[PDB]
Design a protein around this ligand. Sequence first.
Ligand code: NA
Length: 240
Amino acid sequence: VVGGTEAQRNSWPSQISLQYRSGSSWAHTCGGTLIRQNWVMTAAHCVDRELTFRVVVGEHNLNQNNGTEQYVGVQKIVVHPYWNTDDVAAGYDIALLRLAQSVTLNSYVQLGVLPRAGTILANNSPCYITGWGLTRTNGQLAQTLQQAYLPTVDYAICSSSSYWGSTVKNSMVCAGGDGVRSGCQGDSGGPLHCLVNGQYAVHGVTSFVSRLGCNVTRKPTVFTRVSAYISWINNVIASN
Ligand code: NA
């Protein structure tokens, strides 16, 4: 997250870190949201690679023991069947991960609340992106969980020629685009939390940014719109 601030450690308890085994170690690769005790939602493009993955919940500092982490293997990966890896702009950038064990809930580990199907945010709605992603274009991962305030940009504006044009689809949410704050590599898969009727909900799964860089004016971060996939998600979970 570029232009973010450190999150409080009990602010975003559904945020997870998706890690892959990198020699003797594990490395953060993207974010996600805990949606059941044994299921995680992330971006499809985060699990394109044939790697060994684990989820970490209750994580705040990637490089320090917080005393709150639970580490769980990924047992099954269900990518959206219409996902096409060389076509992120087509959409369907969403995947569900079944965890080897169910995690235990506490003030650091909670289920993400999903919006109701079909819900669309008004232009300029207050939202936060969270993650451990790069803190500058071509920079390095954050140590501690970051948050940035990224007001939504509605489809009409986002899909205009000076923004994203036809690349953005109705099944996406855009947010930010001020040139200062944005998503960045390593934030993919993580949540966009938007305050609606007094309650944060996860409206977006971080999907892409410009190739011109993370924080670029009129290129708001693009998220998979979670409210477009509620049926898909429930169907997956029910059939597994
Ligand atoms: Na930690």
